[PDB]
């Protein structure tokens, strides 16, 4: 199952994204053939846009400090981002809908957000997709 770790401090926003690979390259071994390597990069392409993977309110004013990627196919999957946001409080709902769209394998994710306030922990599946910050 995929775990989702989401700490907010202020301004600054970090997302750890820790995934089987099966969840979001359709196969669960290493990317020997060519059919592998394209599922590998169809991946890659759409961790490598968070704000949109992550549906962030534009309003909230949110940009991309620092992303790392890391995978043996690049099984599992590991998405690092910091993310800055000139107006964290109009960051209400974390949303997996568009993840859920994006990774239709992707049948659950184990959220745990962190932030002054505590530990907040929720199972998000495309039906209930919404964490409250």
Sequence with gaps: V???????????LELELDSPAMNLVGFEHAASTDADKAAVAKARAQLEKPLELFALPVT???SVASQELRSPLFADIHAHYQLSCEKPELLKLLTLAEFFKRFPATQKIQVQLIGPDGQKGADLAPASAE???
């Design 131 to 133: 964490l409250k910050l």
């Design 2 to 12: 995929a775990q989702l770790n989401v700490a907010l401090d202020g301004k600054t």
């Design 60 to 62: 909230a004013g949110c």
